[PDB]
Amino acid sequence: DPLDHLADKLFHSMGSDGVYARTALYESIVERLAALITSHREAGTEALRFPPVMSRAQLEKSGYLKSFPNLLGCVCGLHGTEREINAAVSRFDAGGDWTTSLSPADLVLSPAACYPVYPIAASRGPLPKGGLRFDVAADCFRREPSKHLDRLQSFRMREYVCIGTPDDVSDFRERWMVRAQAIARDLGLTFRVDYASDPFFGRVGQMKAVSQKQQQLKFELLIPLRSEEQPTACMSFNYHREHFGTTWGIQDANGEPAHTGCVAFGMDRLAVAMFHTHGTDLSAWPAKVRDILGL
């Protein structure tokens, strides 16, 4: 795989595919990318930072299980009595399976950064004119083990989320699709923006995808990393219509169920794209890119 050679400078093995320790070099560029993204934040945008876990009930309510049940990481633990826990530990001591004593917590690992923002927004009553905009980030988890450096199980996601009327959200997404491309250009990256779909689970799911593609609810900024034939989505631009507005009872300024949309930046994918494109020697990166990043 074309990205494999980057591993030695960027990552250390943590004994699990898609889960890596990040070197100082790698983290310095993720940090500069995050700072660059922040510098493009629209005025009036509320910034929230989420932990890597969120309420299981909130995620269930958002409908994640109808779409990607196969990707979800649930938090489980030994919730029993002292005696039961001791047996589990004793089983482990004997080289057995202590994990049979696990039961689900009321938490999951967040599969995307925006999910927790919807109930937060909803708790504030009806939307002002022009809607609400949020800047959110979380370390996310998707259960998709792979050896490829652009397909991680644990990865950073940064998002700008818009909640409002259809026009508010559509205008928002159009601004960000142009703006994202300008950022990618400034970063010296090769890319194209194309129609896309989420990888919905099951037979029905793949037909949900076709319909999604047909309605142009999702665009991706695609960067050739292993090949030009199979480029990597490093950003997405998502229109959810009224799904979350209805789910969480968010009402726009006109009394109608809010529309929502988000622009998502895959921070690790962007960092890997930078190193693939420009190499691991920062002093040799192009002057304009070094400048854009404040190096």
Partner: peptide, 26 residues
């Protein structure tokens, strides 16, 4: 075309259940 009629997803789902699956033959 086929999606401009007003057929959204939940509407396209029933069309799957009425009658490999690529964004071309539909």
């Amino acid at each position: 075309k086929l999606v401009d009629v007003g057929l959204t997803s939940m509407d396209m789902v029933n069309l799957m259940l009425g009658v490999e699956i690529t964004p071309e033959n539909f």
